[PDB]
């Protein structure tokens, strides 16, 4: 369904034929809660500044091509080498450990739909969401058309069409020109490859304390005990760090690679072959009547995004430490078990030998000639590892507690909580809503306690005196301190 070519600002599109066209979603859910005291703001602003933004030429049109070019840039590795491909033996062998040596089996239809979630789009192209199309208990006549063509092609074991529908991603960022884009997944491609890869992530799932793909991790459980034990089992200096601009880099040999991987335990069937091709197909993506091409980059839209950008990370983490190990003329292997580390989509925390502490220069410099671009987690500094006591994950850090191990969200994504609400209605610049009585906000208040309360009766009093102003716009209480604070200890345990 690409016609004609555009030409605009460099950008490899061409008109949308075949199918109607999806104009993006203009503005922001969130608005400001009124009254909030300046001493609890943070800085974060929406990604769509909208007309608040000064720049009159920052449309939203404009402003998803201007990050859409960045897939169409040549990926970094046109080819893995061997210290990827020594990775790629070490996640086999972990994942037929893990399997026993039997392949998953692929879910039939009404097992591998249950998994999508109520709150999905379908796609580019079939309009709303899920719930719009399975209302009265049954599918409509759209949704069920268009999963009956796609299952059957799907079986027939020829490759669906790995287009998405673009978007600019609603979220609050720190007010610095890279925002992320959204890639709703058409519900097709979604349900076949619910069918092929749901067992084994859920097998991983279960478990992801252990690592190192940390998918499905309850960071208010016991599992932070295990991650934490497992990162200090081996050593006692550790790297965390940060990646800018990963899923839009990816080489694509690495994403394939990935996938195959993960494919390799599963039931070999026509449907499993299908999945596997989509996915591994350069990814396309409809913004409005324009449909745009990829040369790199992973879709957080694919089925699986969390996974499979999970095993990428393993590969490129432990081969930059391989290479850098071969430069010096030692041979080095198993790293996930001599060195334990996790791995979160773009996020990781490795436990470091002496000899990798020592080589970090050379692991930073060969992560760069990757393609990646790592970051201090700690978002000040420059990369160097720290003491336990000192790392990050998930955005979170930890302290040693009476009730084992507890994470702390920052402080700032606490704060803005106060700030900000993801309202019900878009909003074209930044500015104050109303709308506040709502029982997902004194949800998410409620729930703001308990992570205030792990960084202490000071910062939790705190967070509190403004949760009491904002009882007046919703209906919310406000606990104790040792009331939030036994909620963190029922948790755990
Ligand atoms: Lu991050």
């Given at each position: 369904?690409?016609?004609?070519?555009?030409?605009?600002?460099?950008?490899?599109?061409?008109?949308?034929?075949?199918?109607?066209?999806?104009?993006?979603?203009?503005?922001?859910?969130?608005?400001?809660?009124?009254?909030?005291?300046?001493?609890?703001?943070?800085?974060?602003?929406?990604?769509?500044?909208?007309?608040?933004?000064?720049?009159?030429?920052?449309?939203?049109?404009?402003?998803?091509?201007?990050?859409?070019?960045?897939?169409?840039?040549?990926?970094?590795?046109?080819?893995?080498?061997?210290?990827?491909?020594?990775?790629?033996?070490?996640?086999?062998?972990?994942?037929?450990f893990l399997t026993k040596g039997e392949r998953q089996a692929n879910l039939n239809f009404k097992a591998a739909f249950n998994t999508l979630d109520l709150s999905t789009s379908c796609?580019?192209?079939?309009?709303?969401?899920?719930?719009?199309?399975?209302?009265?208990?049954?599918?409509?006549?759209?949704?069920?058309?268009?999963?009956?063509?796609?299952?059957?092609?799907?079986?027939?074991?020829?490759?669906?069409?790995?287009?998405?529908?673009?978007?600019?991603?609603?979220?609050?960022?720190?007010?610095?020109?890279?925002?992320?884009?959204?890639?709703?997944?058409?519900?097709?491609?979604?349900?076949?490859?619910?069918?092929?890869?749901?067992?084994?992530?859920?097998?991983?799932?279960?478990?992801?304390?252990?690592?190192?793909?940390?998918?499905?991790?309850?960071?208010?459980?016991?599992?932070?005990?295990?991650?934490?034990?497992?990162?200090?089992?081996?050593?006692?200096?550790?790297?965390?760090?940060?990646?800018?601009?990963?899923?839009?880099?990816?080489?694509?040999?690495?994403?394939?690679?990935?996938?195959?991987?993960?494919?390799?335990?599963?039931?070999?069937?026509?449907?499993?072959?299908?999945?596997?091709?989509?996915?591994?197909?350069?990814?396309?993506?409809?913004?409005?009547?324009?449909?745009?091409?990829?040369?790199?980059?992973?879709?957080?839209?694919?089925?699986?995004?969390?996974?499979?950008?999970?095993?990428?990370?393993?590969?490129?983490?432990?081969?930059?430490?391989?290479?850098?190990?071969?430069?010096?003329?030692?041979?080095?292997?198993?790293?996930?078990?001599?060195?334990?580390?996790?791995?979160?989509?773009?996020?990781?925390?490795?436990?470091?030998?002496?000899?990798?502490?020592?080589?970090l220069p050379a692991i930073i410099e060969n992560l760069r000639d990757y393609g990646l671009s790592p970051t201090a987690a700690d978002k000040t500094e420059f990369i160097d590892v720290c003491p336990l006591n000192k790392i990050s994950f998930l955005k979170r850090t930890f302290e040693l507690t009476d009730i084992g191990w507890v994470?702390?969200?920052?402080?700032?994504?606490?704060?803005?909580?106060?700030?900000?609400?993801?309202?019900?209605?878009?909003?074209?610049?930044?500015?104050?809503?109303?709308?506040?009585?709502?029982?997902?906000?004194?949800?998410?208040?409620?729930?703001?306690?308990?992570?205030?309360?792990?960084?202490?009766?000071?910062?939790?009093?705190?967070?509190?005196?403004?949760?009491?102003?904002?009882?007046?716009?919703?209906?919310?209480?406000?606990?104790?301190?040792?009331?939030?604070?036994?909620?963190?200890?029922?948790?755990?345990?």
């Amino acid at each position: 369904f690409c016609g004609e070519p555009i030409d605009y600002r460099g950008i490899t599109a061409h008109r949308l034929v075949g199918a109607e066209p999806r104009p993006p979603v203009s503005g922001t859910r969130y608005a400001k809660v009124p009254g909030v005291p300046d001493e609890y703001k943070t800085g974060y602003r929406p990604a769509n500044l909208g007309r608040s933004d000064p720049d009159s030429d920052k449309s939203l049109m404009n402003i998803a091509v201007k990050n859409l070019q960045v897939y169409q840039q040549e990926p970094k590795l046109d080819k893995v080498d061997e210290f990827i491909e020594r990775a790629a033996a070490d996640v086999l062998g972990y994942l037929r450990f893990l399997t026993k040596g039997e392949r998953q089996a692929n879910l039939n239809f009404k097992a591998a739909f249950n998994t999508l979630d109520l709150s999905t789009s379908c796609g580019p192209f079939v309009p709303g969401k899920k719930i719009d199309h399975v209302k009265d208990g049954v599918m409509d006549q759209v949704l069920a058309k268009h999963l009956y063509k796609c299952w059957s092609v799907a079986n027939s074991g020829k490759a669906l069409h790995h287009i998405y529908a673009c978007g600019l991603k609603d979220e609050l960022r720190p007010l610095d020109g890279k925002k992320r884009l959204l890639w709703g997944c058409d519900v097709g491609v979604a349900v076949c490859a619910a069918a092929v890869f749901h067992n084994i992530c859920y097998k991983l799932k279960m478990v992801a304390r252990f690592g190192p793909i940390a998918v499905g991790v309850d960071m208010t459980s016991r599992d932070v005990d295990v991650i934490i034990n497992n990162l200090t089992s081996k050593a006692s200096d550790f790297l965390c760090l940060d990646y800018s601009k990963w899923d839009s880099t990816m080489s694509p040999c690495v994403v394939r690679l990935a996938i195959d991987i993960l494919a390799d335990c599963c039931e070999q069937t026509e449907l499993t072959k299908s999945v596997v091709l989509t996915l591994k197909s350069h990814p396309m993506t409809i913004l409005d009547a324009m449909i745009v091409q990829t040369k790199r980059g992973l879709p957080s839209g694919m089925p699986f995004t969390s996974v499979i950008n999970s095993i990428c990370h393993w590969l490129l983490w432990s081969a930059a430490v391989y290479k850098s190990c071969a430069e010096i003329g030692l041979h080095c292997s198993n790293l996930y078990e001599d060195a334990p580390f996790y791995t979160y989509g773009d996020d990781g925390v490795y436990a470091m030998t002496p000899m990798m502490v020592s080589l970090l220069p050379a692991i930073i410099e060969n992560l760069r000639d990757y393609g990646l671009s790592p970051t201090a987690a700690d978002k000040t500094e420059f990369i160097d590892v720290c003491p336990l006591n000192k790392i990050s994950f998930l955005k979170r850090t930890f302290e040693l507690t009476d009730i084992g191990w507890v994470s702390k969200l920052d402080k700032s994504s606490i704060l803005r909580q106060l700030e900000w609400s993801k309202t019900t209605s878009r909003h074209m610049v930044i500015e104050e809503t109303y709308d506040l009585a709502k029982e997902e906000r004194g949800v998410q208040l409620e729930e703001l306690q308990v992570a205030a309360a792990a960084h202490g009766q000071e910062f939790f009093n705190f967070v509190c005196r403004e949760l009491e102003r904002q009882q007046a716009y919703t209906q919310f209480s406000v606990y104790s301190y040792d009331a939030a604070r036994k909620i963190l200890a029922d948790r755990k345990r």
